């Protein structure tokens, strides 16, 4: 039942949430690490619940804080959608022990503790994978916890600090000490916190929730090994100077911290030239399909292959492809397409697949085991079946050896299965390796004729010619943008090239062994390339004993671009 409401205020993070990055002792040294932390002076949602959408996202990790003293808060739940369709975490605190479970429980709109039952938390557990029991963690005070999940490993750090009567988060420092690690290894996008109410009875609670980011931190250990101060590396340029110089004091002078560049924003698409469209209507529906032993082959190039209109040409069910996807055929671009249309038996429809053997395969039609393409088969019982029985269709039956991939046999003769020569007469041990298909409208599903069209695509080895109508949106003329050109990945600010690339020229090499003019195949336009604006950053500041004010100087760039 819905009986709880919640309000959200907001506050600053000040400087909190620094946990011992590694369980290693040091002394009187400064250590620089890179890990997940709470960036300083960040955004905090002060939640106040009173008796609601407890769907709080999890992101990468969570920092939780509370100041209640009645032990009203208990346990946590983690998951991605929190239904019975997926697993979820069941870390529940208790005055005696602590229990963690992973199963596809069914949580209601607001799980809670009856208080000592969890039926309202979840109806049942069906397919469970992990269980664990241990000693409980929770034992005028401020209680801080940090939970994270890295490489399928769930780690919790905690700290209980004493606080005076202060309204907001106190200043100073307080390290977090590790407590727990477990191997769960699931995706978790959000989390919920459980409350226990006696019976119900009115209650109130308040807490702070924050999210963490991967940053580089610097920490100062004292002579006993307890962290007393830390410095962020991405807060303000002075902090960057402190991180680079590796000290807590900066003297008067000028220092160099890092560089700056203009980031790319978009991407540029340059397809092959387009003038015409592929004639798909003359292959799938022509009132004629060649025999299986002598199959037709049509070459398709220099046109746009609209596979979407294929469904409107033949009454088939769906595509089946091996090296490509039916829905992704409008993006990939191929230099050549091959169409092979024929008629086979209903039970022989399953006989077209890599790594298969049959009478049709090794004697009529063979494809490489590395086939990259699609096959479309549809029944044609209303056109290739006659009351008297169709006789035009023939298929080979006897052959001396198996057919190689993409090989056809049309030559006819009298097959010999005896020592004596056939001598052109089909007598003893002399047969005809060509049998006519028996098609009738009264036959079964597996014996009805089926029209099969095989489309084979050639990968990007030659200049591409066949793919969908992708617009070559010109990359404006003054944008720091990346570009993908037929396998070449690059970036820069790119204008129109005034260079006179003679019709054969497609790429321009600079003095420094790199491209400075590129070519779009869609329209014969050559494009000029220059590097994106970039430079260095320096900091001018007096000694730290005087003031923290600094000045930032960008090298070689006027105040016109960032």
């Amino acid at each position, epitope marked *: 039942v819905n009986l709880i409401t919640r309000t959200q205020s907001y506050t600053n993070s000040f400087t909190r949430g620094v946990y011992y990055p590694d369980k290693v002792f040091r002394s009187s040294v400064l250590h620089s690490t890179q890990d997940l932390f709470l960036p300083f002076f960040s955004n905090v949602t002060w939640f106040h619940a009173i008796h609601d959408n407890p769907a709080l996202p999890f992101n990468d990790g969570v920092y939780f804080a509370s100041t209640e003293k009645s032990n009203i808060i208990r346990g946590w739940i983690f998951g991605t959608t929190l239904d019975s369709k997926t697993q979820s975490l069941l870390i529940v605190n208790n005055a005696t022990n602590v229990v963690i479970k992973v199963c596809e429980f069914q949580f209601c709109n607001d799980p809670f503790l009856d208080v000592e039952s969890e039926f309202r938390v979840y109806s049942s557990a069906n397919n469970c994978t992990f269980e664990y029991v241990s000693q409980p963690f929770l034992m005028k005070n401020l209680r801080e916890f940090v939970f994270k999940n890295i490489d399928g490993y769930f780690k919790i750090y905690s700290k209980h600090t004493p606080i005076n009567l202060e309204r907001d988060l106190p200043q100073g420092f307080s390290a977090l000490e590790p407590l727990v690690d477990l191997p769960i290894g699931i995706n978790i996008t959000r989390f919920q916190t459980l409350l226990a109410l006696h019976r119900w009875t009115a209650g109130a609670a308040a807490y702070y929730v924050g999210y963490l980011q991967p940053r580089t931190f610097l920490l100062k250990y004292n002579e006993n090994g307890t962290i007393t101060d830390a410095v962020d590396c991405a807060l303000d340029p002075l902090s960057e100077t402190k991180c680079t110089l590796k000290s807590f004091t900066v003297e008067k002078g000028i220092y160099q911290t890092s560089n700056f560049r203009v980031q790319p924003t978009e991407s540029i698409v340059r397809f092959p030239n387009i003038t015409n469209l592929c004639p798909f209507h003359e292959v799938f529906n022509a009132t*004629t*399909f*060649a*025999s299986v032993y002598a199959w037709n082959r049509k070459r398709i190039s220099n046109c746009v292959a609209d596979y979407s209109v294929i469904y409107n040409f033949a009454p088939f069910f769906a595509f089946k492809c091996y090296g490509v996807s039916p829905t992704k055929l409008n993006d990939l671009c191929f230099t050549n397409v091959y169409a092979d249309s024929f008629v086979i038996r209903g039970n022989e429809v399953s006989q077209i697949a890599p790594g298969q053997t049959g009478n049709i395969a090794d004697y009529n039609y063979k494809l490489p085991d590395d086939f990259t393409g699609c096959v479309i088969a549809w029944n044609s019982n209303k056109l290739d079946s006659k009351p008297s029985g169709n*006789y*035009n269709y023939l298929y080979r039956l006897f052959r001396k050896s198996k057919l190689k991939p993409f090989e056809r046999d049309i030559s*006819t003769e009298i097959y010999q299965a005896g020592n004596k020569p056939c001598n052109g007469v089909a007598g003893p041990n002399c047969y005809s390796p*060509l049998q006519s298909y028996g098609f009738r409208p009264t036959y079964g599903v597996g014996h009805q004729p089926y029209r099969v069209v095989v489309l084979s695509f050639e990968l990007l080895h030659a200049p591409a010619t066949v793919c969908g109508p992708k617009k070559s949106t010109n990359l404006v003329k003054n944008k720091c943008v990346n570009f993908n050109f037929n396998g070449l990945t690059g970036t820069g600010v790119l204008t129109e090239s005034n260079k006179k690339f003679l019709p054969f020229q497609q790429f321009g090499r600079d003095i420094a062994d790199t491209t400075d003019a590129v070519r779009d195949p869609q329209t014969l336009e050559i494009l000029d390339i220059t590097p994106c604006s970039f430079g260095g950053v320096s900091v001018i500041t007096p000694g730290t004993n005087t003031s923290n004010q600094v000045a930032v100087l960008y090298q070689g760039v006027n105040c016109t671009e960032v």
Partner: nanobody
Framework: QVQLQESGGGLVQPGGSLRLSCAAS????????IGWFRQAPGKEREGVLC????????LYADSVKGRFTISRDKDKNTVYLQMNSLKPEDTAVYYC??????????????????????WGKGTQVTVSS
């Protein structure tokens, strides 16, 4: 696939000459017996000429023996019919047809008459008389 289309014809004086040819496109049968047929308005259609596919064994009709010359070319898969000494009784709608050979008693014998698998649109041959 298998489609038969004819060419030639028209109106000619008695004793003239004509050439009629029907082209067989898409044919795939190994052995078959194609035949030519004519039908004057008011009479039943009947076979005219037919030759063997393997070697070209000439078979002619009594009424049109000698006057009707037939030739089969495998290069274009078409049958050429030559007409001469035309008579008023030759006025009919001429058709071309294709059918397979009869396989009875472990032998190869070409059979025409009725029971033809495919037929063409046909042409009209008229004698001025």
């Amino acid at each position: 696939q298998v489609q038969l289309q004819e060419s030639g014809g028209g109106l000619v004086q008695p004793g003239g000459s004509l050439r009629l040819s029907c082209a067989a496109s898409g044919f795939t049968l190994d052995d078959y017996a194609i035949g030519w047929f004519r039908q004057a308005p008011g009479k039943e259609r009947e076979g005219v000429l037919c030759i063997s596919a393997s070697g070209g064994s000439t078979l002619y009709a009594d009424s049109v023996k000698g006057r009707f010359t037939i030739s089969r070319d495998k290069d274009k898969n078409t049958v050429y019919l030559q007409m001469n000494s035309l008579k008023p009784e030759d006025t009919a709608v001429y058709y071309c047809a294709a059918a397979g050979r009869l396989d009875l008693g472990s032998g190869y014998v070409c059979y025409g008459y009725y029971g033809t698998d495919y037929w063409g649109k046909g042409t009209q041959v008229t004698v001025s008389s």
